[PDB]
Amino acid sequence: MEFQAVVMAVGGSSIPKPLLPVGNKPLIWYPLNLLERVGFEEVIVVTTRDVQKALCAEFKMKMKPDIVCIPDDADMGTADSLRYIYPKLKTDVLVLSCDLITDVALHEVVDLFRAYDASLAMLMRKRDFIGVDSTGKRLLFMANEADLDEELVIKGSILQKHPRIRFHTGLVDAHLYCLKKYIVDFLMENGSITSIRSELIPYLVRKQSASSQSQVRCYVHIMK
Amino acid sequence: PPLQAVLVADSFDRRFFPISKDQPRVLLPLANVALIDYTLEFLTATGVQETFVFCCWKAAQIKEHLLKSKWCRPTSLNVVRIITSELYRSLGDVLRDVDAKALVRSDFLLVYGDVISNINITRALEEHRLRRKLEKNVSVMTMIFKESSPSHPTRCHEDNVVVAVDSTTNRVLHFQKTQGLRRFAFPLSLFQGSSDGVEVRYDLLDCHISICSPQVAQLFTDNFDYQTRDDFVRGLLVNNQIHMHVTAKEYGARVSNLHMYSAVCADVIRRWVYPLTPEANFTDSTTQSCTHSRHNIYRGPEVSLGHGSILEENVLLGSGTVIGSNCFITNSVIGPGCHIGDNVVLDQTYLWQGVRVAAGAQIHQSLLCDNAEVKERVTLKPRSVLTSQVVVGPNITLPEGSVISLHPPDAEEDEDDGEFS
Amino acid sequence: QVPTRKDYGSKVSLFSHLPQYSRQNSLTQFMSIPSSVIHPAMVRLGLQYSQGLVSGSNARCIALLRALQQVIQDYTTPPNEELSRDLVNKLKPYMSFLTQCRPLSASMHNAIKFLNKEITSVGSSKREEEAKSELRAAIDRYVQEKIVLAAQAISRFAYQKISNGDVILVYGCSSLVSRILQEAWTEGRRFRVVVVDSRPWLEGRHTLRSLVHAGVPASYLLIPAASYVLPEVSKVLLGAHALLANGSVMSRVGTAQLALVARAHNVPVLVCCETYKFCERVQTDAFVSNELDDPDDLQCKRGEHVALANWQNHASLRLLNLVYDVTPPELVDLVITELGMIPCSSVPVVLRVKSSD
Amino acid sequence: KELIEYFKSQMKEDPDMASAVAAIRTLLEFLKRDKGETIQGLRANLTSAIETLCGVDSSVAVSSGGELFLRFISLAYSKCKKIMIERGELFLRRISLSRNKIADLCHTFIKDGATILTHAYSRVVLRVLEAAVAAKKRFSVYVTESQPDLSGKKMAKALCHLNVPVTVVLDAAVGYIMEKADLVIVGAEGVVENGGIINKIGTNQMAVCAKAQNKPFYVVAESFKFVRLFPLNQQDVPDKFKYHPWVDYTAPSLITLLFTDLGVLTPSAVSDELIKLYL
Amino acid sequence: GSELSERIESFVETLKRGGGPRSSEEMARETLGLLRQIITDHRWSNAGELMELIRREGRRMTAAQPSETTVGNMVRRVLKIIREEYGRLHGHYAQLQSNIIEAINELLVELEGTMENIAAQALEHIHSNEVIMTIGFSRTVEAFLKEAARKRKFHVIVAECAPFCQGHEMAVNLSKAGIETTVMTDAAIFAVMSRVNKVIIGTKTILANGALRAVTGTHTLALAAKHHSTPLIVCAPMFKLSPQFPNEEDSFHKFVAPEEVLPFTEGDILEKVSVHCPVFDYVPPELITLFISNIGGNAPSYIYRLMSELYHPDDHVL
Ligand SMILES: O=C(COc1ccc(Cl)cc1)N[C@H]1CC[C@H](NC(=O)COc2ccc(Cl)cc2)CC1
């Protein structure tokens, strides 16, 4: 099995993504259908429990061949989710999560992850300053502005390596990442970092117990 | 409308120590040809009809040299206006003098007098005019850059620049120099100023061929503190806007320091600045015509190559030169009327006019200016300079960084002989 | 089942029997993401091949052997079956997927043939795990010797041929030729190398960068100007992609042209190759068997006017960039292999000796 | 020393004897006399003999012999040398029958009524012509005078005793007489891998003219002359063998066939023999 | 007066800096018009002084750009015309000038007919279902081929010229007329040569030896044609004929900025590597099968007689 897909169901102003709002099919039904459409006979889903166990009971009613819905603690997040499900995964991870209403032919992002043997591949569509190279495939710089106490950070070394960087501001991530096994090794070995979405930025693609394996390249796909 | 230009013939930033003290920087022969001659050739080739040569320091010498040049002949299609003043000491002063006297009228080429380039800016000029016509003449300047690599020698760390531009309108949003900086910052509201894609560029070599509207001069007189071009750009981008044109297939660079001088000389000898090549004799001279042989060996007339003397590659030999036998010249420019001894090894050494070298001399990556002299058994380490009729005695080996001249406060040597102090 | 790749563009009539593919339109967009029909490593390698990330012959063969190691390592014998036949039967779809992503090279063909021969030679009575890692160790030994020891031997044999102060002309990118020149410069030889390159791949920049990093004096020019520089050249060194039974050299498209012009200029032509790239196959032209790259690569970015932009919109316009060409054995002087120096006449003899005969 | 004078007197012993045969005889007696019973020390004395003998004589044939038969004996510890001397004796016997085999395979390739064209004096060419005339074959002969050492006159004198019309020609007149020669037979002094021959200075001219007129270019040589060299141009040949050079190289492109004791061979087959022998 | 001087200058600098006009037929027309205006707008009475000033200005022209030989050889044509007129009137001053002017006029009216002459001649050299190969771009050769295409069906293989891929626009122009055209890299010349019937190429200059100075890479194509014994045809008008010989001259190849061969963005290696970009190259006459001109086909072994017919032998040095 190349990929062991996982779908997180914990949110992370408008809409609790886990349970309530369903136009036509349950919120996780779209991720589950996207997964089952392209192989993925086995799926691991992480079930909320701060709802007082009101999520897993109703998500086994979608007529899917077989899925794994692991229970959670009284309250945890998404990096907590990955650390919780670490012992039961043994290969590369394809992390999605509940709020995913998308058209994506994920063959593209998975091919980006494969061809260049990336440490990580991501999916985005048009306050997070994201800078890519001329090809637009490899992730050079990425940083929110809530994080950014100082004005803006960019190293001279990365500009010497990659001269021109194309930047974007109005990019929103689909939370669709393809994680290596050793990145999950790093995550488990360092409980410091929570909120995976914020864990993408300490990529340290450039050379500084931190490299559990060489290069740790990262990549992006920008949708139509 | 016609096309004017401003040619600042005095690099006010005091750099060439003490080479500028003897003759102005713009008169330094790059490869037997002055830099101002290269700039005038570029200006008349790109289509400039009237230029304004502002000379401040050693103005008499510059005027005398230019008056005899081709560009001052009555048949020349490029008109020159040598302007004379000991008052202005900065580019901003030049531009405010321009707007005070009201010389330029429209889209004049601002350029210094020490630029080596062959860029045809008709495309950039029409782009600038289209931008100003469409957007209410709010674009005041178009900065012309060349696609480069951060590793290229012609991109010195002193003049290295990093910009943040708009990939759609190519307008310059942020601009700064990376001299001695391991950290670059780009303000936040750059993204607020242009909302359709910001791109940071570090591969851009600054050609210093900015083509500007008279509004640039109006602004330079509206802000007395504006002294040079970089300050003007910084002050305008923090507040009218500036635009850009990037060149891929044409050469351009200004000789700021000695490193840039060497790099641009090596590029010119190797025909990177075609058609501005030594063989072409772009200046209508008689002592500056050479025959381009294989491996870029511009063997001139009556050079008198010795028996077994070897010219490896990218070697220029001025006319009237005399080269001993069993010599080894490689990637070096030899000025006209130079005598070279026997078993002399020259490597990337720009021997100017009248240089006399005795037998056994080993000169590497040096610069012997006019009428320099070295005696028998003299070794020069890289980045060593001799200046204006200075003599180095026998059995001397100069260190790496060693400038020798007849000016005590401006050299490691003085009026005495170079043999010993 | 793996679908067939659509043949992009309009093929030249003489090459209608060969496939023409587009780099943009890949083959993995109709496959399951957790690939099951094709092993993950094999689809990975096919995608790497199609995009052109793996170019060199030695590089392609080594990547193939590593992917095959990853495959056999993860292979498990089904019940009531023997590994000998089952594994060689299961490897065929992977080879077909590869050849669909990009035609197999001679090194790849020879490696796959040797691997199948070894698999069929695995004992029926033997268990599974030690058979698997015996196959892994055999692949390790095979690649180790046939690549690195062959390279070292050929480097020594070529060093005892390069003299001091001689100009050597090289063409395109070749790991073997670059290693030979680097080792010759390190040993003490003082020479200069002229690098010849050709559109559209411009693979000569690779060996140019390698030589400049090694400190060897280098010069660069494209293949049309080769006639101008050969008077200075003292010797032509090339890297073969395949050596056929008749002694002909099947290598990059610009090799035979350079050999012809060098013969016209009295410049001896040397080709460096290993024994594992020898092939009992034979051809007399670049038409019977070749590879057609993406014709869209011919388009030149000459500033503002790309002339071949919409070449498909012109009915009578055909584009073609050949990846290989054959040099007749009489245009080549030396072939430097593990066995030493041989004439191209002696290639099939070496083939026989390497056939355990 | 001991080998120098014995080689000299072997040359004096048999003026009708080759130099490679004398070299193998001298090395055989050298190994049989000193009684070197050492696994690795024996090779030192061997290569000393070889270097001495090609220092006195600048022949590629002597060095090639040396190399091939030193490998042959080394390819054969007390019983090692005891069987090695056997194999050396049989090697000498085969090398003796070499020239007779060469004559009696190649004498049938001379169509009678033809015109042989030969370079400087060579024993193998003389033997094959003797075999041909013994088979009742009449033909005309042109011989190059071999200007450096007038061996063409010697060849003409030796062949006149065989009752055949011999016309020694000028060194530079082969280009004039090439149209009057039905074939060219030259005895190679050494055979390189690719099939070329490192023979006297004018042999390359012979071959080039042959290709200029499509005339068959035949070469006769013993297999102890097979040297493992690969010269690309004239200067690529070892300079020691050249000493105004004395011996130059001829590409296999210019040679039709080789007549060795191993049978008639295409210039392609000598490399096969050499790589089977493994130097 | 000064109009003539400034026009001569303008022309000199246009020839020196870049290529103007682009077509060398237009260059011949321009230089002939300028020579006419010179011979009209000077105070010359004896033919010797006129020839001397013409030689001086032609020396200046040749020094402007040596690789552009059309200007120089047409200056030599004008000198031969002056010599012929002087011999006619001496073997007479106003008649001399007007006769020289009408001679230049007939030269000019026959100048624009060379294109059409070669186009008409093209038909009897192309048969149905033939495979042509050509390299680079040549207006004469594309006119040749598109005139032969009106009555014949054939294939053209255009080898692009690196770095200046002028062959691409030639292939497009040929495809416009429905001439089945294959475009390839120059690296594939020998690989495809085995399937080519003829080679038709233009030229920049024909030397007295019969050799021709053509775009780089054409010498390799000629070597391939000789190897495969395919006829190599050169469709060159009679104003590209240069009386100079191959190695009695100077400045044969034209070297342009290496930026065309290796770009500036390669970085530090550009200080260690020597890049060379020769535009033209030398093709010996042994590799040419037939020359096609405005008068008709001729073997390379008759170009010397054409020289004797065009240029005075004392004017080969200008
Ligand atoms: O289709 C093409 C295109 O050729 C190329 C297109 C591109 C490239 Cl890369 C190379 C070649 N060429 C034709 C040219 C006629 C031929 N032969 C015939 O049609 C028949 O030939 C004969 C028939 C009878 C005689 Cl007597 C001689 C030849 C077939 C192929």
PDB file of N, CA, C and O and ligand atoms in Angstrom, chain C residues 12 14 320, chain E residues 129 131 155 157 182 192, ligand 1:
ATOM      1  N   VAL C  12       6.183  11.832 -38.414  1.00  0.00           N
ATOM      2  CA  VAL C  12       6.760  11.766 -39.749  1.00  0.00           C
ATOM      3  C   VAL C  12       6.459  10.400 -40.352  1.00  0.00           C
ATOM      4  O   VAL C  12       6.488   9.373 -39.660  1.00  0.00           O
ATOM      5  N   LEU C  14       7.986   8.308 -42.239  1.00  0.00           N
ATOM      6  CA  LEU C  14       8.988   7.254 -42.127  1.00  0.00           C
ATOM      7  C   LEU C  14       9.054   6.673 -40.721  1.00  0.00           C
ATOM      8  O   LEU C  14       9.526   5.542 -40.549  1.00  0.00           O
ATOM      9  N   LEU C 320      10.084  16.929 -35.836  1.00  0.00           N
ATOM     10  CA  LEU C 320      10.715  15.670 -35.453  1.00  0.00           C
ATOM     11  C   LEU C 320      12.064  15.960 -34.814  1.00  0.00           C
ATOM     12  O   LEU C 320      12.895  16.656 -35.405  1.00  0.00           O
TER      13      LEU C 320
ATOM     14  N   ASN E 129       7.550  13.617 -55.805  1.00  0.00           N
ATOM     15  CA  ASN E 129       7.846  12.762 -54.655  1.00  0.00           C
ATOM     16  C   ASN E 129       9.345  12.719 -54.367  1.00  0.00           C
ATOM     17  O   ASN E 129       9.914  11.659 -54.096  1.00  0.00           O
ATOM     18  N   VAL E 131      12.678  14.220 -52.058  1.00  0.00           N
ATOM     19  CA  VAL E 131      12.978  14.628 -50.689  1.00  0.00           C
ATOM     20  C   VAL E 131      14.120  15.632 -50.746  1.00  0.00           C
ATOM     21  O   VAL E 131      15.275  15.263 -50.992  1.00  0.00           O
ATOM     22  N   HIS E 155       8.838  16.663 -50.707  1.00  0.00           N
ATOM     23  CA  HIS E 155       9.050  16.897 -49.287  1.00  0.00           C
ATOM     24  C   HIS E 155      10.330  17.694 -49.079  1.00  0.00           C
ATOM     25  O   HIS E 155      11.334  17.461 -49.758  1.00  0.00           O
ATOM     26  N   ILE E 157      13.016  18.913 -46.023  1.00  0.00           N
ATOM     27  CA  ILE E 157      13.501  18.755 -44.657  1.00  0.00           C
ATOM     28  C   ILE E 157      14.375  19.959 -44.336  1.00  0.00           C
ATOM     29  O   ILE E 157      15.451  20.129 -44.922  1.00  0.00           O
ATOM     30  N   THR E 182       9.363  18.963 -43.031  1.00  0.00           N
ATOM     31  CA  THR E 182       9.809  18.413 -41.760  1.00  0.00           C
ATOM     32  C   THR E 182      10.881  19.319 -41.170  1.00  0.00           C
ATOM     33  O   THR E 182      11.858  19.660 -41.845  1.00  0.00           O
ATOM     34  N   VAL E 192      19.352  11.744 -40.771  1.00  0.00           N
ATOM     35  CA  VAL E 192      18.298  11.736 -41.780  1.00  0.00           C
ATOM     36  C   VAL E 192      18.849  11.737 -43.202  1.00  0.00           C
ATOM     37  O   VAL E 192      18.096  11.464 -44.147  1.00  0.00           O
TER      38      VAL E 192
HETATM   39  O1  LIG F   1       7.319  10.205 -47.603  1.00  0.00           O
HETATM   40  C1  LIG F   1       8.421  10.718 -47.686  1.00  0.00           C
HETATM   41  C2  LIG F   1       8.970  11.659 -46.623  1.00  0.00           C
HETATM   42  O2  LIG F   1      10.379  11.457 -46.400  1.00  0.00           O
HETATM   43  C3  LIG F   1      10.997  11.990 -45.301  1.00  0.00           C
HETATM   44  C4  LIG F   1      10.324  12.869 -44.437  1.00  0.00           C
HETATM   45  C5  LIG F   1      10.919  13.256 -43.238  1.00  0.00           C
HETATM   46  C6  LIG F   1      12.172  12.758 -42.895  1.00  0.00           C
HETATM   47 CL1  LIG F   1      12.767  13.053 -41.300  1.00  0.00          CL
HETATM   48  C7  LIG F   1      12.883  11.946 -43.782  1.00  0.00           C
HETATM   49  C8  LIG F   1      12.293  11.570 -44.995  1.00  0.00           C
HETATM   50  N1  LIG F   1       9.279  10.458 -48.722  1.00  0.00           N
HETATM   51  C9  LIG F   1       8.989   9.524 -49.793  1.00  0.00           C
HETATM   52  C10 LIG F   1       9.924   9.782 -50.980  1.00  0.00           C
HETATM   53  C11 LIG F   1       9.702   8.768 -52.114  1.00  0.00           C
HETATM   54  C12 LIG F   1       9.821   7.329 -51.583  1.00  0.00           C
HETATM   55  N2  LIG F   1       9.701   6.335 -52.638  1.00  0.00           N
HETATM   56  C13 LIG F   1       8.635   6.132 -53.481  1.00  0.00           C
HETATM   57  O3  LIG F   1       7.590   6.749 -53.404  1.00  0.00           O
HETATM   58  C14 LIG F   1       8.926   5.132 -54.594  1.00  0.00           C
HETATM   59  O4  LIG F   1      10.309   5.191 -54.927  1.00  0.00           O
HETATM   60  C15 LIG F   1      10.824   4.707 -56.088  1.00  0.00           C
HETATM   61  C16 LIG F   1      10.049   4.001 -57.018  1.00  0.00           C
HETATM   62  C17 LIG F   1      10.635   3.581 -58.213  1.00  0.00           C
HETATM   63  C18 LIG F   1      11.958   3.909 -58.497  1.00  0.00           C
HETATM   64 CL2  LIG F   1      12.618   3.494 -60.037  1.00  0.00          CL
HETATM   65  C19 LIG F   1      12.734   4.599 -57.563  1.00  0.00           C
HETATM   66  C20 LIG F   1      12.168   4.966 -56.344  1.00  0.00           C
HETATM   67  C21 LIG F   1       8.838   7.075 -50.433  1.00  0.00           C
HETATM   68  C22 LIG F   1       9.095   8.072 -49.294  1.00  0.00           C
END
